[PDB]
Design a protein around this ligand. Structure first.
Ligand SMILES: Cc1ccc2c(c1)sc(-c1ccc(N(C)C)cc1)[n+]2C
Ligand SMILES: Cc1ccc2c(c1)sc(-c1ccc(N(C)C)cc1)[n+]2C
Ligand SMILES: [Hg+2]
Length: 97
């Protein structure tokens, strides 16, 4: 049996500018088994208009890229939440502007 913790990067396509359109990305990789939950949150609310890659597998583990087009503002908070068996509790990774 193999258990591997998701590695998570949360990043915008470009440096943020309030009122300027951009992409927000949550890349989750290196995990096993494939059981996982991934959501993007804006101000504590699941983001509805999201795209992602088809769940896939690399001998060196599982990976998903999950993203959305967005326009940030001064006060909006974004995060990617990941749950996986290797985590003691679901992990919230904030977008650091
Ligand atoms: C599958 C896989 C493995 C590693 C991996 C990714 C995907 S995506 C990533 C990444 C690296 C640098 C940055 N910025 C400088 C914004 C954003 C994301 N890494 C390091
Ligand atoms: C985790 C979490 C939960 C709730 C939550 C946030 C983060 S951030 C937020 C907020 C409230 C007001 C504004 N403006 C007036 C621009 C922008 C963001 N709420 C309401
Ligand atoms: Hg899905």
């Amino acid at each position: 049996m193999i258990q591997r913790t998701p590695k998570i990067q949360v990043y915008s396509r470009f440096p943020a500018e309030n009122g300027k359109s951009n992409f927000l990305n949550c890349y989750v990789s290196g995990f096993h088994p494939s059981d996982i939950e991934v959501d993007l949150l804006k101000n504590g609310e699941r983001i509805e208009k999201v795209e992602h890659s088809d769940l896939s597998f690399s001998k060196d583990s599982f990976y998903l890229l999950y993203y959305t087009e967005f326009t940030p503002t001064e006060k909006d908070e974004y995060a990617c939440r990941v749950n996986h068996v290797t985590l003691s509790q679901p992990k919230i990774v904030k977008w650091d502007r």
